[PDB]
Amino acid sequence: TKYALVGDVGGTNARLALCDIASGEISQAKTYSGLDYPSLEAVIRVYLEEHKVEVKDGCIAIACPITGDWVAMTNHTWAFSIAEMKKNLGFSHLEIINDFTAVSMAIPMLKKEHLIQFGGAEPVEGKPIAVYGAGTGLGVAHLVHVDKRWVSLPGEGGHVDFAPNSEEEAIILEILRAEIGHVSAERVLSGPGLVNLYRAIVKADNRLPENLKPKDITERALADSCTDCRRALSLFCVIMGRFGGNLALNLGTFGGVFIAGGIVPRFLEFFKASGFRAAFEDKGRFKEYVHDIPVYLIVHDNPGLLGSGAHLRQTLGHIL
Amino acid sequence: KYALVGDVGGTNARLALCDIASGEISQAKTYSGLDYPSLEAVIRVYLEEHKVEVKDGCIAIACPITGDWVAMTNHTWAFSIAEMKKNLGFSHLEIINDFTAVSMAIPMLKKEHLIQFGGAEPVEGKPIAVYGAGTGLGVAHLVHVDKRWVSLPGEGGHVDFAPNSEEEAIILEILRAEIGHVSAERVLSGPGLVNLYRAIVKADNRLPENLKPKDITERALADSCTDCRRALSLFCVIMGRFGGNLALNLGTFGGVFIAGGIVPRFLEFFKASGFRAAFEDKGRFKEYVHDIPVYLIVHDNPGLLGSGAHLRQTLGHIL
């Protein structure tokens, strides 16, 4: 039984792949729309019959809290019982994990080409790792090396309070608080949050935001067509740095801080020139605590899939 | 039979004996840092007074523990762990952060050392966060990895202050103008209370007094100063909110623990406060933290206890 099933579901998209159990290598990736199938189980059935593979074991990352046996997505209508699904497909193992648990578990598998460093020096081996990423949501997980085991620590850290550093970011906080209630980091660091930032800068200035999508703000910011857009993106990069630096301090993250691509590669050279690193380190006397911690942009295309394979293989008894 | 354990913070160094077989602490004594040129000196005084031979120690210190050089901000006192180990002739000399120590105590605390503030029951083997406001703001996490609890130190007290209202933002900007970066510790700590009090005053366009942290709690509890009362109220809410962020960030279904620094001296005020609703005030993620218990630790020496646990475990004992 050479392959296990691996997957990465985020709102409407479900990508399934094969992981070679011996090497952890990913192959035969294929994507489906969630709108076209009534459940994750149905798309797995289709994927498996459609290639011609027999699997016993699988691991699927989902972009929502995995809190127990019943999983209900927020950004799509799928809702399912893990145990019910494992039974129905006849698997021996069926791990459902959070998407950032999966991304954290890809970290040990990542090599230099997959990483772009933004500041700091070198990781201190065996020391904790933080991973986060702004996409549809703000994801955060942590990773620690205990013995020979990579231990991911999943959370919902994208939902902590947003911490403004300026009178300006504070007016933005007020505006968003006036309109929604609790303002989380996710409210500003994500696709939707980039748009929240734009609307709020424009609104702070008593003007009327146009109905822009995240790709629009990014598009105009890079093109220089919109100073509001460029301000939104600039602030986003700054809040991004501060947020990651907070994670570095909170768990003593000398093994490094990882950003899981998401929206960021869409604007790599803008990010590269931004205040990101300097926001990362802007921690008063604690600048020196975080100053040598490296940040890496993860640029693998499918870290969720890789991470799912890694998580499974460790569960299967393998050492990475 | 005996090992040396320690709890060094600021002005003071508390030293005691730990029974290596049971983990019990005895002969605790608290020395003033000002009266001594080094922690090593203090240790020699203590070990001279007590008539036991000790080759093993663990000292918890209220500062980041990176490598071999340990630099105290609240005293100075800076030292080499390797050098101290050598000078004193120890087999093992473990030097840990103070919240590392407190986290190591949690697994041996019994219901009398705990006072619960909301939520339900811990989910067994799930992560724990511990924090506490004292001379500084400490944070550490504990995770259950392969049959044992593992301590995750850090400097989580120094992350940005995250104001949730227009008023706390006004305080943020007031503190931002006077100093730079405003960390959570700027507001959740003894000195934090003074900062809150000053900022509350300046914001009502008045001039603050040169008050001390115990001044704040006294006048609050005596109800003899509406600015001090207000600061304390606000401290309780920020404390709840800060604890809620910790729980969200590491999924701490194991529970959140507060190490009593300044809190027990206003215990009933704290119980009456907005603490728990602030802890839970997380938008749609209210439900994620609603069942996570908070416990105040009322054990008098969690640092000494946890230094002992840390050392005994290092010496091969299963806890």
Ligand SMILES: OC[C@H]1O[C@@H](O)[C@H](O)[C@@H](O)[C@@H]1O
């Ligand atoms: O997609 C990244 C993150 O988005 C958040 O809104 C969800 O609550 C997390 O579970 C997820 O990891």
Ligand SMILES: OC[C@H]1O[C@@H](O)[C@H](O)[C@@H](O)[C@@H]1O
């Ligand atoms: O004493 C509580 C905390 O205070 C902070 O100021 C120090 O940086 C920490 O190392 C310590 O754990």
